[PDB]
Symmetry: D2
Subunit: 320 residues, 4 copies
């Protein structure tokens, strides 16, 4: 079967979500399917706030950050009774399946829907690059460029004043963004959650650099590891060089998607449709060793471990 | 007289400084003069740290941020005895005049040295836009782009989530940055130090916005006015909408100068030399109503005044 | 009187046209006026293709290139009989006046409408910076940045191979864009329509540069002056250095507007409304010596001469 | 053995080359080796033009385009006698191995030198993406952004005017650039050299587009396939819609490397040295399915093959 499908964006927004939706809509249409766009992820589902999507409703969207459909958190969705009101709207709208774009929270919702007879496909949308079974997630590369662009500006100013700059990068519990940024910006030190942090190894590395004539030091550090103001104070004390802490924040979440994002989103969206049409349900799409793959949601969540990019850390240390 | 001139960068670095230097060196060379570059602003002047500059030393500098001579904050320059040393260094090297590129603070140093008999020329180099006698200062336009770009990015994320975003802008005690940025980013409310700040008006304006169906709200505020974190929480409580505070910081000070900065800097550089060959000293260059102008330093510091830009603000409120 | 007004964009598009329209709409609304948006400039007028514009129809437009209303050429409009069908649509729609955003072609149309009892205000929209009675036009600064961004990339590649690069810049019969670009990119030679071109002065300047150790030469040249392929061949022959010609083209017309554009458009749009309300008609808005001014359209067109930016050319030559 | 290595950049410059060099120099230093930088690719090798490189010579290079050692197209390197001279220069300087960074052509030189007994290592440096045994080459991603950005800009102008835009992309005999660009810019039609070009299909697709109400149409075509000017006129006649051809040119080759290039380059650089210390020679590094890999040069040049990317193209047509 499957005549009509639903699409939503749930969880934290990431550049390339619009490309993904377009990817879905255009794929669907071409295959003679009808498409409903659901507002504010799962909440919109619950409240029955939807719209009919044609090919033009996804035009002028490919090079746009955010999610035109909106995103929202709806913890309640974990309650089967809430999902019962959800399913009724589905029947009542004649939706046969959905494509969900989000993180792991979103994939769980989607698993719940599948066992209730509404096959769902999950696509990775997040700048954190922390979803299992994918080398990359949509929004990663866009954030990477925002961060590096920031580090470039900081180098200019840091040089001018022979300063040390600490930069707090997003990623929550994943150091991928930090680490990649650090290589690309030629940072002097990197602090990621996956490695034990030694304030001491840091100090030594900075002084060694200073002894070598380095005019500036740039420290890349993942958020939630310490208070960057405290850390800046500590460095200034112990090194005699004025330190300045910078917290990029939410700028990392916005802006026009980079080509990698535009293209990954596009390809993923199209593969979503092909999956539904071949009868799959409760799968999460991913990109592994440059190949598009699909896994059972439960399998990916409970059975896969997020590998540590050790080879990139080794490389980082050699180019200091 | 006047066969050899000196040139330094003082105070907070600003994009376009390299362009100003290049302006100076190239003009001077063409007029048969010799140029000495003083390192680390007033610190290298005191420590007698200088190098000779040829036409090639300013090559590949026009599109770079920072200052290759370095800059410093040497508060001790306030002492008339330290300035005594600096002047001796100047005479020993055979230097006839000095070209100082910096902010309001650097203008004071230049003034003090003029008062001592050493002829200087001040060029407005600061992202802040706070020097008297000039519509703009080198680096303003560049920082304006860094900021506006940041804002374009926050509009995307706060829209996807129906959030309120508080952006803290540099400027110190000047609102130009914050104000030009709020109009260019189409901000909901602007808070500057030249106008009385009313938590009331802010909440009321925002609420109004929500009534009319605005998906996001961007509030642009000058630094040192409050705790954006405290202010953020306060907004969240009073409106029921999630709020996020972003502190741009030091990214505003770096990066490749925008066209305007590159050009202004070059023009002021060439003009400095013209003034020198004419026999003027103790003067500062500015751009006034599209005209390259010079004033007695003393006149600018003391008896000039900052124009209340009700003009930009009345327009700002109209477009909300 | 005046209860309702019309707005259109005519002639070649330029970044910041959307900011201008927003500027008008929001200003109008705030003043209790109603607003019609006319499609494809004057053609749309003729054919009666309009829409009602509210405050939301101009949202998410400020940072967007192009004109959402469209532009189109309609030479026929010069015929009074065509204008008669135009006026009937106006009456029939109850439009009392219009704000026209374009070039001088557009201003003439607008003059015609005024004498026929429908007061029109003209705003400068064009990357050429060639409208009389304005220091700048909307779109100029955005193009300037696109060109300089291009020149920066060309320097990198030119250096690597010790090449000469000729870059053809837009501007039609005005060298403002070329000249500004040349200073900002540190070009070795500039060719603008306003100055007699000597292939010889060019060759000499290039060899002198080459004799001096210059690793690259960048030549900035305004379009319609020669065939850049022919000119590249000529340079290669006479200098022994491989030459490459680059024609930027239409990339110059697009992209997100720079802050200067966002703000000039905004201010101009708002001033348009104030003019209509004070009873003026048949005026063209401009920015002169940092002041917003208005002139009689005929006066501006037939009586003002486009000044030559001689002071910028003098400066260009000194920094070679 | 192996105490001193050499490093050069050959062929068409590519953004990330500076990053590759830095990769090499920094790794080598760390392993106790000595590094010689050869100027102007195979030309300086022949003329024996070299410099010693320390850790500081590669500082401030990571974010810059081009190559600071220079590059050259020295066709004469084809002569076995010229290569005889080059090898003598190498032995006289005490150099044990060579690291060559260039394209398909440079790989031939490296191969010929290996054949003569001098051990080399090839690193894929070219915007084209045409080397066998690597998914990507240094500079590809950067040129992809230069292009996509160009396209975002043309969408704005061609939309305001209901125009068709023909964009000519670099690549030589490889379609990757053109193809990735067409999907990322949401192009209407793509013309590449790996597929048969049908003027018919093109007009028919475009006409289709107009039927469905498309305001613009962007056609992305690889260079050396036709005369975009001729093709432009042909389209204009057959569709009644104004067409414009834009030739991106050399802007594609320059500018600051994107994050991906910066990182890949660093990683390949470090890897070269590892291979050297292991005793391998006559090898070339590539990135295959996210893995750093090495192959016998000979194997890559001769018996490897280019993968028909029907995959990207089938998806391209789906999203139109
Ligand atoms: N029915 C329509 N009415 C108006 N504009 C349209 C229509 N369909 C497409 N367009 C416009 O034409 C351009 C190209 O359309 P399309 O190829 O579908 O967009 P995209 O490349 O962004 O996917 C865009 O500016 C789009 O907004
Ligand atoms: N176990 C679950 N069962 C059902 N729905 C869930 C479950 N976990 C999360 N969700 C739904 O997914 C939404 C997003 O979850 P969250 O953890 O916030 O995001 P992410 O997908 O980014 O990890 C939640 O608000 C809720 O609607
Ligand atoms: N009153 C003063 N007398 C003499 N020198 C001064 C005076 N004020 C500032 N300076 C010098 O100018 C430097 C830069 O000033 P500052 O206010 O910190 O920044 P900026 O010039 O960037 O605005 C000071 O560090 C000091 O060397
Ligand atoms: N003596 C020299 N040796 C090497 N490179 C030089 C020399 N003089 C100039 N160059 C290089 O040649 C290019 C052109 O120089 P120039 O026009 O003077 O630089 P800019 O445009 O930055 O003012 C630049 O990349 C510069 O670094
Ligand atoms: N009635 C509405 N419905 C949906 N979104 C709206 C509405 N009004 C405004 N918005 C959105 O809220 C944001 C801010 O609105 P507004 O201040 O009017 O835009 P802008 O700053 O671009 O002028 C934009 O993303 C806009 O699209
Ligand atoms: N003398 C005129 N009288 C009436 N309408 C005119 C006149 N000149 C131009 N127009 C109108 O203005 C439009 C734009 O003119 P054009 O010269 O193409 O542009 P621009 O305003 O950019 O100079 C024309 O298509 C026509 O509709
Ligand atoms: N068959 C060959 N034998 C020896 N050297 C070669 C051969 N082909 C190319 N080269 C050398 O490699 C250089 C660069 O090659 P080219 O094809 O022009 O560019 P790229 O390496 O950038 O792809 C040539 O100029 C020449 O010095
Ligand atoms: N000996 C030195 N003298 C002057 N500046 C130096 C020296 N060594 C490094 N630097 C400068 O200090 C900063 C940090 O150096 P480094 O980390 O080695 O550069 P990069 O990050 O580009 O690898 C750079 O701006 C660089 O040019
Ligand atoms: O948007 P919030 O709620 O302020 O949360 C910030 C967090 O969300 C992220 O920006 C991205 O998270 P997602 O996994 O939901 O996409 C993290 O990097 C960051 O820690
Ligand atoms: O760079 P510091 O020493 O942390 O000081 C930051 C201050 O300098 C500035 O960045 C620039 O101001 P000045 O040019 O006057 O120094 C201010 O906006 C900011 O308040
Ligand atoms: O868009 P077209 O018709 O190809 O014309 C190109 C011309 O239009 C411009 O791009 C701008 O012209 P406008 O005065 O109409 O805005 C010129 O720079 C260029 O010569
Ligand atoms: O730079 P040139 O000598 O004009 O040649 C241009 C050619 O070089 C490239 O820019 C890059 O190709 P290579 O790296 O193989 O030299 C091609 O895309 C283009 O065809
Ligand atoms: Mg979660
Ligand atoms: Mg470093
Ligand atoms: Mg100051
Ligand atoms: Mg707004
Ligand atoms: Mg005209
Ligand atoms: Mg130059
Ligand atoms: Mg090649
Ligand atoms: Mg399209």
């Amino acid at each position: 079967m499957i005549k009509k499908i639903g699409v939503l964006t749930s969880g934290g927004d990431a550049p390339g979500m619009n490309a993904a939706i377009r990817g879905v809509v255009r794929s669907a249409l071409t295959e003679g399917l009808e498409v409903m766009g659901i507002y504010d992820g799962y909440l919109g589902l619950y409240e029955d706030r939807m719209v009919q999507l044609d090919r033009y409703s996804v035009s002028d969207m490919i090079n746009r950050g955010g999610t035109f459909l909106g995103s929202a958190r709806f913890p309640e969705f974990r309650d089967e009774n809430i999902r019962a009101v959800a399913i009724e709207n589905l029947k009542k709208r004649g939706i046969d399946a959905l494509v969900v774009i989000g993180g792991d929270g979103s994939y769980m919702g989607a698993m719940r829907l599948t066992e209730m007879g509404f096959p769902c496909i999950g696509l990775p949308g997040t700048i954190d690059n922390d979803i299992k079974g994918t080398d990359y997630t949509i929004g990663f590369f866009t954030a990477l460029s925002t961060v590096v662009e920031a580090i470039d500006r900081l180098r200019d100013t840091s040089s001018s004043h022979q300063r040390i700059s600490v930069v707090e990068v997003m990623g929550r519990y994943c150091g991928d963004l930090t680490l990649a940024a650090a290589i690309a910006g030629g940072c002097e030190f990197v602090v990621v959650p996956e490695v034990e942090f030694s304030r001491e190894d840091l100090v030594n590395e900075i002084k060694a650099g200073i002894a070598k004539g380095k005019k500036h030091a740039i420290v890349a550090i993942t958020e939630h590891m310490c208070d960057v103001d405290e850390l800046a104070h500590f460095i200034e004390k112990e090194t005699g060089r004025e330190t300045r802490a910078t917290v990029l924040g939410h700028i990392q979440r916005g802006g026009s998607p980079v080509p990698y994002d535009r293209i990954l989103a596009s390809r993923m969206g199209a593969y979503a449709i092909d999956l539904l049409l071949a009868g799959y349900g409760g799968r999460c799409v991913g990109i592994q060793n440059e190949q598009l793959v699909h896994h059972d949601i439960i399998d990916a969540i409970e059975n896969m471990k997020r590998p540590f990019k050790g080879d990139w850390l080794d490389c980082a240390k050699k180019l200091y």
